[PDB]
Every structure is written in structure tokens, then in C-alpha cells.
Amino acid sequence: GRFESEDLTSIVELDGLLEINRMTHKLLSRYLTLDGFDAMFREANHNVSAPYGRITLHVFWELNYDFLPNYCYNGSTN
């Protein structure tokens, strides 16, 4: 949800937070039993029962609305 409420530049933040959550799951799985992180991630992304999740939908929405008509490219720096 936090990613869905910001621009496309929050992708790095989402990946970092996801890595933290995965590590916490690994630490907790040492003493407890829990569902696989992939299953929980798919559950939160609404991807288990649907071909596409929320992250891809937001990326498409951001590309159509903000990124494309508000960014200028520079081939020298890519």
C-alpha cells in the first residue's frame, strides 16, 4: 500500500522493505512454523488467484499517467 501511494521511484524502498520482511520471516521460522514468504507475498499482492498482482498494476498506472508525460530522457547518462 505504501508503494501504491507514491511514484515509481519507491521501487527501491519496496525491495529493501521486502528484504527486511523476508529476513524477519527466516529468523522467526527458526523457532516457529510459518507459511513460505512467497505465498504470503502473493497473498498480499493478490497474485495467487489472479495472473497479475498489485505491483504490476501500479507500475502500468504510473507509466500511463505520470512517468511518461513528466520525464525527459538523456542517452548520455541513460
Binding site: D35, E43, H46, V48, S49, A50, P51, Y52, T56, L57, F60
Partner: protein, 54 residues
Amino acid sequence: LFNEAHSFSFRVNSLQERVDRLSVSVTQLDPKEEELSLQDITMRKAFRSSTIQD
């Protein structure tokens, strides 16, 4: 202990039947039958896991 373990036996037997049905179902999937919905459709009921706290 016997009454409790008997309940577990019923649960295990029920799960065994479910797995056998799933194995029969999953070994029949035809790749050509797969279909994908539109990118802008979110009407699908999001799956929710059981959250019963005793």
C-alpha cells in the same frame, strides 16, 4: 489421549482424500486451456488465509 488422537486420525484421513483429489486434478492440466484476464480487472476475490486466534 485416545480420543484426541482419534480426532487427528480423522483429520489426516480427510486431508489424504483431498490430496489424492488434487493430485488427480493437477496431473490433468492442459497447457492450451490456460487463459489470462485483462490487465485492468481487479474484481477477483483476493485470497485470505485463516486467522483464527484461540
